[PDB]
Amino acid sequence: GISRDSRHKRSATGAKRAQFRKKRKFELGRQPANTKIGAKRIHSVRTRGGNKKYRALRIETGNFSWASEGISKKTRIAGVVYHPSNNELVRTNTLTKAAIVQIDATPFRQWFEAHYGQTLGKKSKNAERKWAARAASAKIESSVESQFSAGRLYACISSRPGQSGRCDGYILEGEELAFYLRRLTAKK
Amino acid sequence: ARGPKKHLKRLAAPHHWLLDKLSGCYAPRPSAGPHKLRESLPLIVFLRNRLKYALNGREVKAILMQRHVKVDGKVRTDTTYPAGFMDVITLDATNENFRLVYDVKGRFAVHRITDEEASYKLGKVKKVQLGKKGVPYVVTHDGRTIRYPDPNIKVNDTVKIDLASGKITDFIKFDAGKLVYVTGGRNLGRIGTIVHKERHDGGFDLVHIKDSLDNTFVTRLNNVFVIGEQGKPYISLPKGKGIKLSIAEERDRRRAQQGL
């Protein structure tokens, strides 16, 4: 199949190589998963030495962590926004690592306002306790809140869907979301 | 070359088995096991070529399938089983006890030991790590992992092993001036107590040894098996106590012991 060996591929001097031996199972390579959005479909790739790896195509949900908040909430993945590699992966909404998405926000608003009693944007006993205990804490961020107003959060996949079998990411925060917002209205 | 090689050709077998050129094509391949291929003595090599109990290999199997043999206490029927340094081979009829320990010539000598001394052995700690669930472990040269080690045991140290159960009964740290048994290099078979060590960050520390005649020689840290205290070995050394006589001295002793 595909081969990753360097036997081809001229030596650094510029020298074309002849061909010794053949292609080999262990130099092998396989086709991209090129995973898309919605309707989870996963195929088990059998790799070297047993070793299932998971080929994800069509994945609608992912486990996304709020880094600064120390929690991870399973959300929908609404669509792809930016990719540094290939513009087309945005346009087709293909799920990769380093890919910039927009997720859900809704389980993040249902934890945030149950935790802090705050209600982003715009009566029990022990609840009121911790609610007071948590303050000068819930400041959030200028650019984390305003996203909750359109109810979709910028995330960047840190995982490898075509390998692992999951599309997982973190919420673009501080500097990153400051960077990636620039290219977002410097492209739009 | 598409897989593991399951064969061995005579003349590729390591020289220390002392196998003869003719009289068959191949030498036995040692099983994967406690000890590496090049340092080991398979049980057909020992039961036949050394102990001369078995003529063929077919009698080596007639022996090993009746459980007449055991190694480090366990019966161990594999015709190629890779016995190794510090193992104790025990035959319950004939009531014999052997530990595998090096010659001065670098080879494996048949060394008879006490019904009692047989019951323990020495490993050298190859590594000691913090395992899963926080349980630390140490692992010997001979392939034993042992849970919950004494925390002063560090890498390269030897250990006394129970052999009835897995338990470490004792250890000797690696220090300047501790009786040592070289396993490796040409110096294989010597004894002699560790002058001191060269560091060489970047790999390969060097260990200066002086045996009991005040002769000096060096190896790399890899080959240095700590066996005891000056005098004071923890096992029964074979005759010659690894001093390495010159060819001259060896000619003399042999011809000095002469008259019929």
Partner: protein, 142 residues
Amino acid sequence: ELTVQSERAFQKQPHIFNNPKVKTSKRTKRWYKNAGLGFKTPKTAIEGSYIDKKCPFTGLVSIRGKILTGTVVSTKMHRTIVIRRAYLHYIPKYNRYEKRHKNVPVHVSPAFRVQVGDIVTVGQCRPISKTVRFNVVKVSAA
């Protein structure tokens, strides 16, 4: 040089987290290390803003194997250089030597400022690129 973030991806050190909720003045929390072998991680590696995952200090790349020396003959390639390693080879017939040489590709951290003719020290690495197996650990000249 300059521009920090000028690439299409956000350049960041992996798993190096500054919470935004907790106000700080550095504005970047930075991880580095020491290569060892008596190789001092220079100030420019701990005071810098550069990312370079391939830097032996601020990066992921682990220095092991040979440690070589040679003089810098090409700085063109950004964040990498080529050094001509002169050596003498022995011809047993004529019992003399002859001038042979090799060029070695090596990745120089922007942690260093190198010019052509400055001899350099270099040490072995996991394969970084097609050609480069070595990273620049010291500037030993000019």
